[PDB]
Amino acid sequence: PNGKKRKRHKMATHKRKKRLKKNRHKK
Amino acid sequence: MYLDSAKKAELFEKYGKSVKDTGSPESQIALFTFRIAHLTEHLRQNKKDFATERSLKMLVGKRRRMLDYLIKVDIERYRAIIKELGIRR
RNA sequence: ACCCUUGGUCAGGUUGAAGGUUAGGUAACACUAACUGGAGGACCGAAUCGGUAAGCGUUGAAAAGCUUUCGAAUGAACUG
RNA sequence: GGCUCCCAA
RNA sequence: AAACCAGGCCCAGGCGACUGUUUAACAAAAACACAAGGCUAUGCAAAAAAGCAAUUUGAGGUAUAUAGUCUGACACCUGCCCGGUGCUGGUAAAAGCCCCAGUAAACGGCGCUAAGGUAGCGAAAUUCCUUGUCGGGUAAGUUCCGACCUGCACGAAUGGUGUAACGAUCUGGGCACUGUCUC
RNA sequence: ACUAUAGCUUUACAUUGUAUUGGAUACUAACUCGCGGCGAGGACAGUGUAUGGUGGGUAGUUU
RNA sequence: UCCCAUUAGCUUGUUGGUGAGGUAACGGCUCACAAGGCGACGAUGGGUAGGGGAACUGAGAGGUUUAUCCCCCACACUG
RNA sequence: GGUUUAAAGGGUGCGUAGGUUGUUCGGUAAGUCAGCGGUGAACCUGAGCGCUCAACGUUCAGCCUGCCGUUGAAACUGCCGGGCUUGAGUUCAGUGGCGGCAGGCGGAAUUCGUGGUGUAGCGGUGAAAUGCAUAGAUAUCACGAGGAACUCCGAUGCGAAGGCAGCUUGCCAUACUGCGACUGACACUGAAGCACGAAGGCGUGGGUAUCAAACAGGAUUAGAUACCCUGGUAGUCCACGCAGUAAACGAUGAUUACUAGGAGUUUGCCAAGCUUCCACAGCGAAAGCGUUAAGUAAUCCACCUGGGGAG
RNA sequence: AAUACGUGGGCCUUGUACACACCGCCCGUCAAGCCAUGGGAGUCGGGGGUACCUGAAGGGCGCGCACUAGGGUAAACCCGGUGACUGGGGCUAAGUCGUAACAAGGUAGCCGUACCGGAAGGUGCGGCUGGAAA
Ligand SMILES: [K+]
Ligand SMILES: [K+]
Ligand SMILES: [K+]
Ligand SMILES: [K+]
Ligand SMILES: [Mg+2]
Ligand SMILES: [Mg+2]
Ligand SMILES: [Mg+2]
Ligand SMILES: [Mg+2]
Ligand SMILES: [Mg+2]
Ligand SMILES: [Mg+2]
Ligand SMILES: [Mg+2]
Ligand SMILES: [Mg+2]
Ligand SMILES: [Mg+2]
Ligand SMILES: [Mg+2]
Ligand SMILES: [Mg+2]
Ligand SMILES: [Mg+2]
Ligand SMILES: [Mg+2]
Ligand SMILES: [Mg+2]
Ligand SMILES: [Mg+2]
Ligand SMILES: [Mg+2]
Ligand SMILES: [Mg+2]
Ligand SMILES: [Mg+2]
Ligand SMILES: [Mg+2]
Ligand SMILES: [Mg+2]
Ligand SMILES: [Mg+2]
Ligand code: NA
Ligand code: NA
Questions:
Q1: How far in angstroms lies nucleotide E46's C1' from the CA of residue B27?
Q2: How far apart are CA B58 and CA B36, in angstroms?
Q3: Which of B27, B56, B65, B66 is the Cys-Cys partner for B16 at CB 3.0 to 4.6 Å?
């Protein structure tokens, strides 16, 4: 219950989802 | 499951010695099979009754465990009861 | 050219959809394997319809053809 | 000839 | 396989899903059609089409129907603009017009403005310069394939980008084979 | 592009009448439609004359 | 008597029988009916390694390696 | 050695293999126990002897504490046969529920259209503007149409979990308590596997009122791709089919037995069966848990082994 | 002389990712410098497998026939390398743009999912307290 622990995971999820949304529609 | 005391008594008289023997493995297996068939008939109309499903599955599990007990105790009785009920499928 | 009514024609071979039966399987349907079945603007290919490519012909045998080659060939087929 | 299957009936 | 008879095959691109249709007599195709999608019109003497009319088609069908029009299997999708032009609403003895509002899978546009091109593609059936540059293939490649992006002058139903199967289509490279050639 | 025009559309007169309360409502008998007289509408609609819009659908021409 | 299931099915002399041949010797070892055999108690495949006693190490359990020493196996440029 | 919060309980069940098995009688001898026998260089351990000592060399006593064979024992586990009723299940009765599926019915509110009255604004904000309005809004009355959600009760209760709330009916399922009934260990857990599984999302067809991603406009700001305001499309609703995720949480897996007090509370008769808060022993690093344990113990499953890279 | 007295410091409680103590810590993109590693038209190797065709010696079988090492061919698999171009990640400094989180961090935070933005992020729907205030 610090908060930074969840902030790091939130950052990683943001980056991964941005990568996937950029890669969609391109083949 | 159109199940009432009269039907239960008829089943217990048919399977197992005396009509007061409600606890015999044969009587329990017969009762389980009867309500399994009736619940199947209910489900084919109420296809979305997921609570009546898994209640059907728990009944099937109970019947299987009683049959396994009959295997462990007296095999001839198990052959007789499955022949008289047409269970194996 | 298109339509309407009434008729006719399409050698032979191949593939193997739906469906069905039999075994297993399920609470019951589903689902797996074998046998069967014989669908399709399906396949190969005569008749037939068309006209790809090349050669020939160009006061031609013919005011549009011939030979070889090639497309379709149960269909939106061809034909009286 | 009938039979089977099919729908475009 | 005994003669006659009797598929050449493989790798990789563009276009069009496919079977069909077409310029009788120089073009068979990437053109037309297509199954399918959208929009619009039409309540039934329907709208619509022929006819001076009668009458007929639509159809003896009835909104899961009929007609007009664009797109063209399928997959992922289909951005912004209603300013202009269309369309829809609120004189003789009222319409209109105005004004306001709406409509882009309507025509059209995407440089002071109505909005100043989203995704995806890109020297492309589109690129003038131009045989652009780099990589591959060849001894050597103005064609071909893969990339790059200052796109003269791509771009989302006059559809965008892909796509298995199909093609007497266009285009590049191999093997087989040979009088196409050295001759 | 100029000028016409088929078609479509607006209004007036005719077809076309009655009553109430004019500007609307109501009526039935003109007229229209349906079923085999009855039903549904109704002085509207449709049609004729005139008139204003619209009209590359069609025509004659100019450039 | 080592790891990998990001290796789940493997097997046709393969499992058994009859007979024959062959071998120092039994045997599908080889050759002329039946369909069996092995498999989550890990078959098959892939990777890695010679194996033990020693030795070292730790209170012990255990762990590391087999340099010298001893035992067994494999090999002698490659088949 | 651990798993509430440091890494660590699977979203929840059912269930295959496997693991574990109430009480009692009698066998058997697989596990277990005991006796006897065989087998198991050098090095390593006490005692010597020789290296002038020592390393070292060597001899002898003490290790064989593994494997194999053969004789006995029967307490426990296993296997076989029989018995019991406490566990478990079936029956009967009582009571209870927002438990599931399906069909019908209802009122308040909101939106749109039509008509009547009426005219200078309504709406919105910290303040405004966009917006709607004399081609007649807001407001008010009536007619008509359609979709969605169920105020008060209402914080408790039910369900394996996700979840479940207008009324009513039909068809199901199930919990709890007792029985003077029945069977007689028939049990627990459970790798695979199967089923169910909020919201959002996808396909086909209906429906489309409110709200509202994207988007458009107006503001606030140095800018505002936001917070605020006005519009607005998917979606939100229904049927069928996919998908399989969550702070799917009690961040606490399931069974069984045992171990203090207080304060409330639901249900059928003091007492179960629940559902909530302080709090002994004990546990814990502490915060804290404490009969609904995170205490005392047994069985089985899941998971962890410094952080990032990296789900 | 005039004039009204009502609107930055201390105590208690609470939260904290601050302890040089909010003139605090701190994320993310773009730009810069080193390191490791993905995708890619193609292209170059290494040994093994399957099938076919040839095929030594030495036995066997009836001056020839099987058996076979080795050779050629094709494939397909596995293991490696390189490649125009094109993507993440780690580490070091700090150039640039902001302020997302930590206090109710100035719009409570976080989980899942969807759409959208130069970036931290924003918004919708459901959930949680690991939130104040009430
Ligand atoms: K003929
Ligand atoms: K080209
Ligand atoms: K026991
Ligand atoms: K929840
Ligand atoms: Mg984000
Ligand atoms: Mg054909
Ligand atoms: Mg012919
Ligand atoms: Mg043919
Ligand atoms: Mg074509
Ligand atoms: Mg063709
Ligand atoms: Mg021609
Ligand atoms: Mg021609
Ligand atoms: Mg077209
Ligand atoms: Mg096209
Ligand atoms: Mg050339
Ligand atoms: Mg190119
Ligand atoms: Mg267009
Ligand atoms: Mg003209
Ligand atoms: Mg003239
Ligand atoms: Mg943790
Ligand atoms: Mg849980
Ligand atoms: Mg978890
Ligand atoms: Mg902030
Ligand atoms: Mg904040
Ligand atoms: Mg937004
Ligand atoms: Na050739
Ligand atoms: Na939907």
A1: 73
A2: 10
A3: B27
Q: Give me the residue label for tokens 């009736």.
A: B38
Q: Are B8 and B39 in contact (CB under 8 A)?
A: no
Residue–nucleotide distance: B76 CA to H65 C1' (Å): 54
Experimental technique behind these coordinates: cryo-EM
* Structure-token pair, residue B72: 């462990």
Backbone angles phi, psi at B37, to 5 degrees: -60, -45
List residue ranges whose Cβ is under 7 angstroms from nucleic strand I: A 1-4, 6-7, 9-11, 13-15, 18-19, 21
For chain B, give the secondary structure using H, E and C: CCCCHHHHHHHHHHCCCCCCCCCCHHHHHHHHHHHHHHHHHHHHHCCCCCCCCCHHHHHHHHHHHHHHHHHHHCHHHHHHHHHHHCCCC
Instruction: Report whether A9 belongs to an annotated binding site.
Output: no
